[PDB]
Design an enzyme around this catalytic site. Sequence first.
Site, mmCIF file in Angstrom:
data_model
loop_
_atom_site.group_PDB
_atom_site.id
_atom_site.type_symbol
_atom_site.label_atom_id
_atom_site.label_comp_id
_atom_site.label_asym_id
_atom_site.label_seq_id
_atom_site.Cartn_x
_atom_site.Cartn_y
_atom_site.Cartn_z
ATOM 1 N N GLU A 296 0.821 -1.211 0.000
ATOM 2 C CA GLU A 296 0.000 0.000 0.000
ATOM 3 C C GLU A 296 0.859 1.267 0.000
ATOM 4 O O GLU A 296 0.483 2.275 -0.597
ATOM 5 C CB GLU A 296 -0.961 0.019 1.192
ATOM 6 N N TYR A 383 -1.891 -8.285 -11.017
ATOM 7 C CA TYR A 383 -0.821 -8.238 -10.026
ATOM 8 C C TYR A 383 0.396 -9.059 -10.449
ATOM 9 O O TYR A 383 1.514 -8.537 -10.589
ATOM 10 C CB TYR A 383 -1.265 -8.830 -8.678
HETATM 11 C C1 LIG Z 1 -0.260 -6.756 -0.956
HETATM 12 C C2 LIG Z 1 -1.498 -6.495 -1.837
HETATM 13 C C3 LIG Z 1 -1.550 -7.557 -2.946
HETATM 14 C C4 LIG Z 1 -2.767 -6.544 -0.965
HETATM 15 C C5 LIG Z 1 -4.062 -6.371 -1.787
HETATM 16 N N1 LIG Z 1 -4.452 -4.950 -1.915
HETATM 17 C C6 LIG Z 1 -4.218 -4.215 -3.004
HETATM 18 O O1 LIG Z 1 -3.626 -4.618 -3.996
HETATM 19 C C7 LIG Z 1 -4.721 -2.779 -2.933
HETATM 20 O O2 LIG Z 1 -3.660 -1.891 -3.258
HETATM 21 C C8 LIG Z 1 -5.883 -2.570 -3.916
HETATM 22 N N2 LIG Z 1 -6.176 -1.131 -4.044
HETATM 23 C C9 LIG Z 1 -7.153 -3.316 -3.458
HETATM 24 C C10 LIG Z 1 -8.342 -3.069 -4.399
HETATM 25 C C11 LIG Z 1 -8.223 -3.316 -5.782
HETATM 26 C C12 LIG Z 1 -9.330 -3.113 -6.639
HETATM 27 C C13 LIG Z 1 -10.561 -2.662 -6.106
HETATM 28 C C14 LIG Z 1 -10.673 -2.412 -4.720
HETATM 29 C C15 LIG Z 1 -9.567 -2.614 -3.868
HETATM 30 C C16 LIG Z 1 -5.174 -7.135 -1.083
HETATM 31 O O3 LIG Z 1 -5.193 -8.374 -1.236
HETATM 32 O O4 LIG Z 1 -5.973 -6.461 -0.391
HETATM 33 ZN ZN LIG Z 2 -2.487 -2.614 -4.804
#
Ligand SMILES: CC(C)C[C@H](NC(=O)[C@@H](O)[C@H](N)Cc1ccccc1)C(=O)O
Ligand SMILES: [Zn+2]
Length: 610
Positions: A296, A383
């Site tokens: 984050e 990702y």
């Molecule tokens: C270490 C990360 C892979 C953790 C991951 N969170 C993210 O990638 C956040 O930055 C994302 N912003 C989460 C998100 C994406 C699309 C719509 C709503 C919320 C999660 O799994 O929550």
């Molecule tokens: Zn993210």
Amino acid sequence: PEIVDTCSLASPASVCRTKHLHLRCSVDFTRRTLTGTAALTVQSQEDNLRSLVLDTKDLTIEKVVINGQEVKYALGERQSYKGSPMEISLPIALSKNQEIVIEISFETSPKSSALQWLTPEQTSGKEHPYLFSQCQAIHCRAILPCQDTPSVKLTYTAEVSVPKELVALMSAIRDGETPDPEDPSRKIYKFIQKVPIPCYLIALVVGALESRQIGPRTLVWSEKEQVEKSAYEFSETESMLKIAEDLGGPYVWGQYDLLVLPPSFPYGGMENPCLTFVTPTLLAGDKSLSNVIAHEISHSWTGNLVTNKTWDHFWLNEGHTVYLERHICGRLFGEKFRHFNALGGWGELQNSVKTFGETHPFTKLVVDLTDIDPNVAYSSVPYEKGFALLFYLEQLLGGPEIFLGFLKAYVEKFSYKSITTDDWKDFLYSYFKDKVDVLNQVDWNAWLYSPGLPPIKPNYDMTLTNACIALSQRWITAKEDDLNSFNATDLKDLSSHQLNEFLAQTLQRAPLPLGHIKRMQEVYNFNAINNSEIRFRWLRLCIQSKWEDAIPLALKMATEQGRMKFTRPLFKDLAAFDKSHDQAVRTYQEHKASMHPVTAMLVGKDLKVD
Ligand SMILES: CC(C)C[C@H](NC(=O)[C@@H](O)[C@H](N)Cc1ccccc1)C(=O)O
Ligand SMILES: [Zn+2]
Ligand SMILES: [Yb+3]
């Protein structure tokens, strides 16, 4: 290069741009509605502009005021998950670049897909209600009328009236508090965000919150009961910030606070500027799940400074962020650990591609979201395939030192802008001009537009992964008479991360014979592990291997917390096991009303109910 946002029903950035939002609202817990005015300062990009369209979703509009007079507006037919477009008739045609302020009086629906209203019983304290928002990707339109697209960036100010016993916080700098002149039982909290941001980054939380400082520019916020545990779990935050600053350039947002939400928060983390939201399932007790904070934090550059123009280019946000994330962990714990995490990411990509199907459209790096709810297309692909591409290029172009030089110039180059994959690629070619030969060896069409696993898999050091694979292979190839040879000492030199990877490898070959699973519990006592990532994989392995004892454990984890990453696969596994199928469905029907609106929708879809 004319690109439109197919997920938005608002007038595009080429017609008009929102420059600022002044939000004044009151949070009404008795009605579960947010009511107020959204004053949008809009700048015309066209000559003779006479109307404009905004996104809205389940909003009740009272009136629209411009130059102190009410004006005409019309709400169009609802378009499923996109909501309803709101067309406003300007009282005076505008010339190019003219700016005006449009004040909209509205109220949200209790059903807002951007919000979750929790009763006192659903909080830690048990005495006060709680409210939290989650706008990404396209739910900001369910809180207020706006051009709900990341192609437009605006600054904002806000005044939020809430019960005086509670505290309000937003993705902005706190700008004071006072008693509400119109209602002494309330307090007005003020906020300011001076850095232009896409509206999906607007965030609000109202609850019985307390804070503790853990760094020179960081406070952790949560209900009283979780404060001490959180201060400890996230104590590496400032050192991660310093490393991120070294990778992407100066942190421009001022403060970097953390807010630990109730268990139903749907994600592990959300990069709301000035205030990152995190799941309480990160509270492992040993700081082992801190990569989530590193991630984050990285969005403070890749995502919030340089933003994907439309959700079709989401990989730009997440791909670069996962890449920066692993660099921070590499600096803190060693290059071999970075590779271990990189390799684990590849395995998660294998899982996603396998789950959707290798030819499925959601496995393309760049996807076409026209007619697709982003919540439905969301997966580990942007990702990990995005990360795999950057890692591949890093190895192709000369190593991390060199590629990190590119990432820093990329951020600098596109700061405060919203871009597409072509902008990215164009700059990559510009920056690596002396290596176009190498860049031309990349199968761009396959990497960016084809489904399935990438055409090439990067090279990974396997030092830390080997023992995980070795143990996983021993269990998979073991027959009944080999079960006696397993013992707790097998885990002797494995870190929690390796334990997790050992489970991840075994889970990819599930089911295992029931007897093997029972033995594993007998000698490793995995049921005792509270680390949520490990518990998640272990229970999935138990349910897929059809151990009925694990049913209540899986049901419990699936309902006591709501991080989608865990809740969806657990309900899915429980529904696929015939012994637990009926209870899984029944459990969902029962908790449905008290779940996060989006999560409830997705679980319902997964269970083929409703
Ligand atoms: C270490 C990360 C892979 C953790 C991951 N969170 C993210 O990638 C956040 O930055 C994302 N912003 C989460 C998100 C994406 C699309 C719509 C709503 C919320 C999660 O799994 O929550
Ligand atoms: Zn993210
Ligand atoms: Yb044997």
